């Protein structure tokens, strides 16, 4: 009566799991600097378009990336998330603005040996870095991008310092209160757990390996010009006066209510 269907044995293995071993080291030379800087300068609009369609971004005469929403995870190297796309392109630019990068086998910063010395076009503007008070030409300019946390494997002290700046200067950076302090650091802490094995390693050990003085120097540079523009003050003054208006309206709100 039970009429059972046969179920063939088929174990769940690593082959059936998500093999996401993403490293920026497989993408170090795919950018034409001014091209990837341009794509990064349009990160807001690229994200708006990504809501509707997948994107194809040409990054050099020899390479392109296919940008997806993460749910479309694929082993194919040049199919990537939005944050991975942004990190890959930023790495292509920062190769020419940061003199040093991290060697995890030597546990130290080493010189980035760059055959070709290229200056990113100083006329390409990064609105995210401009909100911080950074100006075009700053070496950190093209690090202020979505998914910057993936850069931790190349520039750990610089990436952590920016995360620290986001944590301290929430309000100057227009970060919503919906974002807890954990929301700010969680992406970075995932990257740090991958490299440092935080289950078996402490945060003190990780921070001393990359060097707190390195983090200190980057934090000072990134925080130097954070503040408020005239627009940010006008918006803050408006909110306070708009709530004044809302308050002065309640007599008439309850009067219309009685009727």
- Please, which of residues 118-147 interact with a second copy by CB under 8 A? 121, 123-127
Residue 19 as a binder of a second copy (CB under 8 A): the answer is no
Site string for a second copy, 146-185 (x = CB under 8 A): -----------------xx--xx-----xxxxxxxxxx-x
Please, which contacts does 218-225 make with residues 24 or more away whose CB atoms are closer than 8 Å? 218/140, 218/157, 218/158, 218/160, 218/161, 218/162, 219/161, 219/164, 219/165, 221/140, 222/132, 222/134, 222/140, 222/161, 222/162, 222/165, 223/165, 223/168, 223/169, 224/133, 225/132, 225/133, 225/134
Q: What is the CA radius of gyration of the chain?
A: 23
* Least distance from a second copy to the Cβ atom of residue 178, Å: 4
DSSP string, 122-145: TTS--HHHHHTT--TT-TTGGGSS
- Distance of closest approach, residue 27 Cβ to a second copy, in angstroms: 18
Task: Fill in the per-residue mask, 201 to 230: x = in contact with a second copy (CB under 8 A), - = not in contact.
Answer: --xx--x----x--xxx-xx--xxx-xxxx
Q: Minimum distance between the CB of residue 26 and a second copy, rounded to whole angstroms?
A: 20
Are the C-beta atoms of residues 57 and 30 closer than 8 Å to each other?
no
Phi and psi, residue 109, nearest 5°:
-80, 140
Q: How far apart are CA 24 and CA 19, in angstroms?
A: 16
Q: Which is nearer to a second copy, 112 or 125 (by Cβ)?
A: 125
Question: At its nearest, how many Å lie between a second copy and the CB of residue 154?
Answer: 20
Interface with a second copy includes 252 (CB under 8 A)?
A: yes
> Between 80 and 119, how does the x/- string for binding to a second copy read (CB under 8 A)?
----------------------------------------
Stretch that binds a second copy, among 4-12, 21-29, 107-115, 141-149 (CB under 8 A): 4-12
Question: For a second copy, which stretch binds (CB under 8 A), given 87-95, 108-116, 140-148, 188-196?
Answer: 188-196
Q: Is 73 in the site for a second copy (CB under 8 A)?
A: no
- Counting residues that bind a second copy (by CB under 8 A) gives 106
Nearer to a second copy (CB atom), residue 112 or residue 175? 175
State the residue for tokens 């794509």: 39
**Residue among 167, 165, 198, 207 at smallest CA distance from 184:** 167
User: Residue 103 is inside which H or E element, if any?
Assistant: strand 100-103
| Interface pick for a second copy out of 23, 56, 107, 137 (rule CB under 8 A) | 56
Figure out which of the listed residues 22, 38, 194, 195 binds a second copy, where binding follows CB under 8 A. Answer: 38
Would you give the DSSP letter of residue 17? Answer: S
């Amino acid at each position: 009566d039970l009429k059972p269907i046969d179920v063939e044995v088929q174990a769940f293995t690593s082959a059936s799991q998500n093999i996401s071993n993403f490293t920026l080291h497989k993408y170090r030379n795919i950018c034409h600097v001014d091209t990837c800087a341009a794509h990064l300068s349009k990160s807001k609009e690229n994200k708006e378009k990504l809501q509707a369609r997948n994107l194809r971004l040409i990054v050099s005469s020899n390479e392109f990336l296919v940008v997806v929403k993460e749910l479309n995870d694929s082993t194919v190297d040049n199919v990537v998330s939005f944050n991975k796309a942004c990190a890959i392109m930023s790495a292509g630019v920062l190769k020419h603005t940061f003199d040093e990068e991290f060697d995890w086998k030597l546990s130290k910063y080493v010189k980035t040996n760059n055959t070709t010395k290229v200056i990113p076009d100083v006329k390409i503007i990064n609105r995210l870095a401009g909100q911080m008070g950074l100006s075009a030409g700053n070496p950190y300019y093209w690090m202020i991008v979505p998914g910057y946390e993936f850069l931790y494997e190349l520039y750990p002290a610089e990436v952590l310092a920016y995360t620290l700046v986001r944590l301290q200067y929430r309000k100057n950076l227009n970060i919503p209160d919906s974002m807890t302090d954990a929301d700010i650091v969680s992406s970075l802490v995932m990257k740090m757990n991958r490299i440092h094995k935080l289950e078996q390693t402490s945060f003190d050990e990780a921070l001393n390996l990359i060097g707190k003085d390195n983090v200190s120097e980057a934090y000072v540079e990134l925080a130097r010009d954070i503040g408020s523009t005239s627009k940010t003050k006008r918006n803050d003054e408006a909110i306070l006066k708009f709530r004044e208006l809302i308050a002065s309206f309640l007599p008439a709100l309850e009067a219309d209510r009685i009727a």
